[PDB]
């Protein structure tokens, strides 16, 4: 049957506490930047990816994985905890202008029937937002992606991400975030995954105001991602976001990026990354309690 | 009565999981370095100190405080958790050659009877170790300090800390650590608080060997401090130390130094520092279990 429910990727409290490890070339660069020998082999990425999944998934309500480096491997090695659900990335990242994801399309070599058969409950689509690029073209992609999910009994998660325009120098990140939300905040996906306004920096009140503003333009449950926010400021970001209407997080770097390049990865993941994710889940439970 | 027992500063498992917030001028400099406005007022130090104590002491088996900035205040405001015991610093730090603690003596304006009356269970003495300074002079100080404690029913904690020599350029930190231990590792204190060899860096086996070597020269329970060790590598340092004979930690910077200078201190202490201390206590419990 093609019945799907948001309940399958939330905690008992109804909040979202989810782990993202689907980063690709972006992770190879992190490993390079931490002083791992180059060129960094693919097996280093899948090793770290499946380790992160097995050590951290006990603490997440879902985990987001990519076919390219660790989807096969995680099911093979039953790396995902029983209590944690599985999101599969359905975006094909295209490099350009010297960055690894300059453009994004829907991944055609994704078999939602296969993936559903392996216990997946949801797919995710990154959507690059540019002020001088066609909004209708974005919306179409999201629509195609929503059907791919829903017709297969899967949830639909979109991730609008704000980039400067192709021709021009007018780029106000904050406004762009809000403009993307106006556009895509009611596109009929099941979940909106969004950047944190002001990088979670500054004063709590200015943040609450910005997160409130944002929440106004999202007509579906939403969560914040950690990219851009310092890991120390992310716990607060989640509190403010949820006080403003957000229902949780879907975070990666703020959980495990600090550990890249250090000796004894499994121990590092256990002693450094795990207490952070644990705390974050405690926090969402606390905020759902306040509703 | 002047009966004292190590059990009063350990967890149920018998391991030491202790919190140090007695840093003085050294902390003012941290606040300065994090971009707090200057000159940094004393009240900023006691504010942070008592906040750290009230938020973190629930997770520690003891907490080390200083008269200068927060001993009065912590008792006044019942800042120390019931389950956590109280160590009071009994060292008078003397600045020199451009550093805030160039030399250390026993603090004479310490009333052990007063302090015991407020529920204190132990005192701590930093001992600066220099290869070209008189060992007998150090030992004497420790002896005086041991009596001050024991005659008042208090435990005795010493903290030998390794410094380069006054005249000369021959300084091998690792050897110095071991030489200090040879000298002071059987001085009749109740606890030895020591720097981590190799800054907790490198390969696990090289560390285990160095920690084993060290343990050989300490004839009392010992614990490691976090100064010098990156906070991410401290959880491992504790595992290796205890696998080598150490019974726990007495750490500060690796718990709370990252949070200095950030907005919303009480929240930062709760969301960032607390999960780290919690983990560390979990780790000592795990290692005592292995004995
Ligand atoms: Br749960
Ligand atoms: Br590379
Ligand atoms: Br790995
Ligand atoms: Br859960
Ligand atoms: Br990129
Ligand atoms: Br814009
Ligand atoms: Br900030
Ligand atoms: Br709150
Ligand atoms: Br490991
Ligand atoms: Br305990
Ligand atoms: Br200052
Ligand atoms: Br404070
Ligand atoms: Br305890
Ligand atoms: Br100093
Ligand atoms: Br030496
Ligand atoms: Br290292
Ligand atoms: Br171990
Ligand atoms: Br606060």
From Swiss-Prot, chains A, B:
| The encoding gene | yihT
Which sequence ranges are marked TM in the entry?
Answer: none
Q: Which SMART domains does this UniProt record tie to the protein? A: DeoC
Protein name per the record: Sulfofructosephosphate aldolase
Q: What role does this protein play? A: Cleaves 6-deoxy-6-sulfo-D-fructose 1-phosphate (SFP) to form dihydroxyacetone phosphate (DHAP) and 3-sulfolactaldehyde (SLA). Can also catalyze the reverse reaction.
Q: Which GO terms describe its biological process?
A: 6-sulfoquinovose(1-) catabolic process
Domain of life according to the entry: Bacteria
Q: What class of enzyme is it?
A: lyase
Q: Where is the active site?
A: 193 (schiff-base intermediate with substrate)
Which GO molecular function, any one, fits this protein according to its record? Answer: 6-deoxy-6-sulfofructose-1-phosphate aldolase activity
The protein's annotated catalytic reaction(s) are: 6-deoxy-6-sulfo-D-fructose 1-phosphate = (2S)-3-sulfolactaldehyde + dihydroxyacetone phosphate
Which Pfam families does the UniProt entry name for this protein? DeoC
What are its E.C. numbers? 4.1.2.57
Organism of origin: Salmonella typhimurium (strain LT2 / SGSC1412 / ATCC 700720)
């Amino acid at each position: 049957l093609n019945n799907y429910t948001i309940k399958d990727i939330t905690r008992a409290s109804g909040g979202f506490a989810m782990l993202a490890v689907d980063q690709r070339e972006a992770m190879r660069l992190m490993f390079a930047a931490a002083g791992a020998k180059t060129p960094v082999a693919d097996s280093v990425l899948t090793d770290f990816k499946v380790n992160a999944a097995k050590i951290l998934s006990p603490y997440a309500s879902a985990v987001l994985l990519d076919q390219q480096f660790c989807y096969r491997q995680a099911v093979e090695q039953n790396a995902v905890a029983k209590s944690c659900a599985m999101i599969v990335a359905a975006d094909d990242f295209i490099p350009g202008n010297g960055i690894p994801v300059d453009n994004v399309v829907l991944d055609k070599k994704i078999n939602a029937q296969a993936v559903k058969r392996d216990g997946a409950k949801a797919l995710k689509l990154l959507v690059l937002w540019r002020s001088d690029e066609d909004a209708q073209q974005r919306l179409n992609m999201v629509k195609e992606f929503n059907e791919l999910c829903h017709s297969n009994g899967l949830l639909s998660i979109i991730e609008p991400v704000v980039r400067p325009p192709r021709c021009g120098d007018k780029f106000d990140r904050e406004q762009a975030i809000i403009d993307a939300a106006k556009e895509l905040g009611d596109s009929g996906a099941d979940l909106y995954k969004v950047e944190m306004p002001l990088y979670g920096k500054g004063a709590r009140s200015d943040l609450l105001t910005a997160s409130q503003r944002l929440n106004g333009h999202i007509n579906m449950p939403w969560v914040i991602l950690s990219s851009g926010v310092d890991e120390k400021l992310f716990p607060r970001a989640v509190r403010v976001a949820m006080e403003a209407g957000a229902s949780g997080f879907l975070a990666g770097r703020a959980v495990w990026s600090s550990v890249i390049g250090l000796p004894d990865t499994e121990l590092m993941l256990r002693d450094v990354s795990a207490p952070k994710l644990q705390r974050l889940g405690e926090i969402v439970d606390e905020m759902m309690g306040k509703r």
